[model samples]
Target chain A: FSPEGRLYQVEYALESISHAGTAIGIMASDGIVLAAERKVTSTLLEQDTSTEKLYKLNDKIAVAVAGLTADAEILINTARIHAQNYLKTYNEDIPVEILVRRLSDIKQGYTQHGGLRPFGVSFIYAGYDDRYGYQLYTSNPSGNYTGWKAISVGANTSAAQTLLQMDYKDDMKVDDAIELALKTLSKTTDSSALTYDRLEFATIRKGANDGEVYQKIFKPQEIKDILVKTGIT
Target chain B: SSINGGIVVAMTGKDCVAIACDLRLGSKFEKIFHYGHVFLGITGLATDVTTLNEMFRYKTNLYKLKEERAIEPETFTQLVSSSLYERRFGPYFVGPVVAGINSKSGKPFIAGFDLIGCIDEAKDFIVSGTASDQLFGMCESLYEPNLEPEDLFETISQALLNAADRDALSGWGAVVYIIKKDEVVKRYL
Candidate 1:
């Protein structure tokens, strides 16, 4: 049957992401913050020294990914290449929406052609540009993307999603957003307790004097410091 | 002719840099261009001049985004070099001069390039175009080792106008841009 309505394959891909770690984003007036929790599978498994879920696509942008770690990295690589090529051709930072649309468009193509399995991942993009001071966007396997002030994806997302709204304000700063993100994760995460070793964090902000976009992907030590400060350790 | 008209000279002074150009596109077109922190002046075909202008606008912008800072004077010249060389098979008939102050070091920089992208980063001055011969003669006689901003303005002005006067294709009027750590000064003749 040639169907125009339901997409079973895409639904399966969505289900796949639900089994993975969770990711969240919050866009404050001054900057954007991203957080993702990684599964700590076993004692024998070697620990991560650097971030696996969060990646910086450019100076002005970072992303938190959910789904097949293997599939997510491939898509992230493509996203990064597209980012630099845009800069090379346009001589400007790729705008927040522009990159989201492009990545979604590529995702859309895969769903249309049924020859290959669609990407089994979703993204929470946190970015800044002159066009929109600070922005957050989410994308799914269905090739749809949405802009948000606060967003959560992956396993037990509804719990984090619900808590995100109850406390969200129109003008939250990055610190408040960090607290909110960790608080919600602490409640909804499968792990008994949230720790620096199981989390990936990053931020996008502007320099005070130079007025240029800046980004930082937190190391485990930095993550530990933030967890202590936020009372989530 | 494609490789005709315009006079551009750039000189490094103490804690400053100076770029000067002749205004002779029927007295309407400017030979000097501003690229935030750096000034690039060119003498070449009018069409190619505008083409490189837009091309550079795109490049420097992307550089700023990737590097998270404005392109430095040293890096800016290399970018111009690679871009010009990209069209080496059929090059733009242009001679370019770059002048700027390095924000981090607070040092003055001056560099010149041939059409094929060979760079000549000079301590004193770089001159190009129809008035290259006349400008070189004048700059050699007048330029000093470490002229102050005031002295640099006077020296470049003297050299540019005197050179422009000797070249029939160049001198309807002249302008200068002096870049110091604090501000930029523009003068006309």
Candidate 2:
């Protein structure tokens, strides 16, 4: 897809199809936190450790969309394009609110294609928007969205939110946020479901400027600390 | 940090000594693996475990190739202890066990060497980690003197399992095998 397309177009072939998931993280200088979990159904099971699920958008808005891998990939690719277009057209990057609106619009269009989808995916859109600095949004598979100081999705959302609701601070440190994510995941999923080698995480920072972007990715080692810091035992 | 069992396991058997190690390094004392590094052996800046293992392997090969020596269990222990003594003032890392068909007398051999190069031969089992003390306790209570080959093998394997349950630095898992009459047989863990 292009901002202004020519009449010509080309088709591409399909690759492998399977169940996959992703996690997005956000952070604020007051400290920010962003992380996601993988969907495990099996088949040479593995978590995405290369690249990252967290996308650093401009200076103020970062997005972490997890769920159907293809949908997430498409949304991110489009968001990137939309972001570039916004920069080319307005010289300013899209803010969090606008980014969420645009992402929802894209998801809606994907659903319209007789895709047999029932909003089976979810996402966490986070970072400082132009007007509302430092925020997090939890989006459903239906393309609907809600904003919060913190949010979680996937089968473990309740456990995660519960863990956070009791102690999460709008001003939580990055390390604490990471610990929360690890503990929440550990509490909801047993060692049988999750283990030291199976966890992953990320972050999106809120910069000083309203438009500054923040991003980070943590390796398996850091994830282990979350289990300890949060008292997952 | 105590190891509650980890995710990877390795085993080795034959004329060669098979040693298994996991990749979980714990935080200062955290139970998690996210931010920990296990010192495989860093006894002295002048000598490290990784380097020592390599040197041991090299020396063993040279001994075999030149002197028809296959790193006698006793020689292996002596060499390691000498290396450790040479660098007593350095940091510590490598903890090792030499398991194989003893080349000298053609029998099974199981021996341990610590960071300081101390050696311990167990007719059956010995281990060190966050779980060492606990494993030692169980071994002490259950160990039988002059254990037969099968009994010895069982003891070593059980020691690993017992440690997995209690030690945080010893799991991921283990491999068990036996060296008999110059032939090494892989056993279940």
Candidate 3:
């Protein structure tokens, strides 16, 4: 007896995600960047070893999450296992879209089978592979995933995306894209400003000499330098 | 690297096993404990290391309760390995080295384990914790084939003492234990 075209359950699922911290993904001409805003950061926390908001699912693929970290952990565990499974069986890293779709399918599977609530999280995955060169994607609680040149999700997303759309360009350099990501979140963040501890930044880019793509999750100290240089704090 | 700066060295002999550990627990804690016939040297977060030791004691005690048999060194190694692999809540961040003689086999056994309990078994020697590289350096040069109990004790003690001197975090004092089939000798230095 539900009304047509109004999937209340799915909307409620995305609602939980909309209340989470912002996560952004941007694709540059030659690379991709993913950034996440963290909450409840502590001064005494271990900086280098404790990765709270981002994860490397494989050598090539990494994820930035905006939701319940505990829930995202289970999904991340599955992602790592699936990535390694593909690597072992095929002698290659799992393709970017394939891994994205696999996680999407997992999210969708939970939507049925007793009509359970969907995952209350959204993910921005950044990866690079030989087939597609560089890729960026976001998958949501509604089991809908889409590719994006630059997109933001979670709380204050529209404002963040507004900043993104105004600044983004197809010919943007990887460094330029990182600068745009930093400023966008800094301006749209609920707080007065941004700091290294409050943000988790990562990027997938190609090495100049080796020709191998490198995925970097910036450490707090590294981010500190960029934040100071950009005058974002 | 939270090993709090302790070191352990163990070497195999003709009919014995020799093990030694730094006295400082990272300039503050303790490192070696005796288990049945096995000697365990652990370094990491001292609190978790302490918990893991007590847990092993509980498991070994319960094991005796159930089977009416004392756990041997090899069985204990497997137990340590499997225990580490099933880390449910959080992992024990300790690197452990086990050394002893099996009463039944009479062959010396010595091995090391990572925090998650992988068994890195070695025939010549095993080193772990903060001073691992230094211990290996000395053990590699000074260790010889089929060392006797006295030579084994001296070599293990020498390796630990010299290695401790080189490692800023792993020294306060030192101890060595030599386990022969019928004799157990321990010395404090």
Candidate 4:
């Protein structure tokens, strides 16, 4: 009956993602911004050592995940390999949408095969390509993905999305997008206050560093500074 | 053994790529369709050239469908190399020359590959098959880096005609393609 009707496993995967911490991405004129809330489950957990939510796939692409961390790690590593393989063959960076589609294709495979559970993860991808400039995309366990100017996934997504819809404007700069992402993250979190230890942040932009394009995942101190600047803490 | 009457040459400027080929398919001449961004010039067995063209078209169209974007020239060059390599045991009897502009930076590139898929980038000029020695000599004197669009056209035209004069297999007619940052123009010889 389960196979004949709705897929219980796939629906369960989607529900698992909604239980994880929220992730948000905004596409701006100059580049893209991605931020995610980190669930501080234990006070003794070392927060500064690893970025659980944000992953850099290449110099031009980064991703934020909001479901099973272990599952996301597997997909993240595969995406990095795909990006490098494209560079090795073609001597050019992978286009944003191609990489997104590649990941979605893999995710789509698990849903159809028997005796396998779909990956319990959803991703918010931020990337830059000369053809499309800055881009924001979100993909779920069901293998569906779409482009967005601003979007959110996981816990409290509807609330964050509503705020994004109210304030997001076309052609806003990366700076404004970053502030908006921080504000949205702060509102979605259950904690009374936002802090560096409880968030993961990254941005993809041109001339933000020495290169033509740059992708930076924020360190703890850098996130702290951004929180201060955005007046989140 | 008359792999004769076949000639392909290409020149690249700062922002343009131009390639020319003798249109002799065998005793008769035929036109090769130009793919977007990349201009492919092949000199080989007529049957092999036609088959390879079909394969390349299908592969490129699949690339567009999957990626939803125009295939870049650099990637197309690598694709040609791999496709030729796939038939390593029974190789295609065609040498391929690919020329186009880089979509990202607008830089021009020309690459040449043997029937077995060994490839080399062409800096000033490259020639393949059928009296390549005669064509090489002509290109050596006429070729210059970053030739203006008009000069590139003139130089390649003369080089092809000179090769045709010396190599009996080199020409019945010719087609020249000049590809720039945004457009492609063709001329006759």
Model 1: which docking level applies?
A: incorrect
Residue B19, model 1: Cα distance from true site in angstroms: 4.4
Top candidate (TM-score):
1
Is 3 or 4 the stronger prediction by lDDT?
4
Which model, 2 or 3, shows the larger TM-score? 3
- Runs of candidate 4 with Cα error greater than 4 angstroms are A208-211, B1-189
How would the docking of model 4 be graded?
A: incorrect
Q: Could you tell me which residue pairs clash in candidate 4?
A: B5-B169
lDDT of 4 by residue, B47-155 (tens): 7877777677656754653454678888998999988989889898887888888789899888888888888886788788767987788889888877889888988
The alpha-carbon RMSD values of the candidates against the true structure, listed in the order shown, are 6.0, 20.6, 15.7, 10.2
- Which DockQ values do the candidates obtain, in the order shown? 0.14, 0.01, 0.02, 0.03
* Tens digits of per-residue lDDT for model 2, A50-88: 433555454455556555555666666566556555655
- Per-candidate TM-score against the hidden true structure: 0.69, 0.43, 0.58, 0.55
Expressed as tens digits, the lDDT of each residue in A13-55 for candidate 1 is 9999999999999888778889888887666755564456887
RMSD of 3: 15.7
Tens-digit lDDT track of model 3 for B74-160: 988999889988884587888988988888889998999987887888889998876566567788989898988888887877776
Q: How accurate locally is residue A166 in candidate 1, as Cα lDDT from 0 to 100?
A: 98
Q: What C-alpha lDDT does candidate 3 achieve relative to the native structure?
A: 0.80
Off by over 4 Å in 2: A1-29, A41-60, A111-119, A193-196, A206-213, A221-233, B1-189
Tens-digit lDDT track of model 4 for A129-162: 8798788899999888999899998899999999
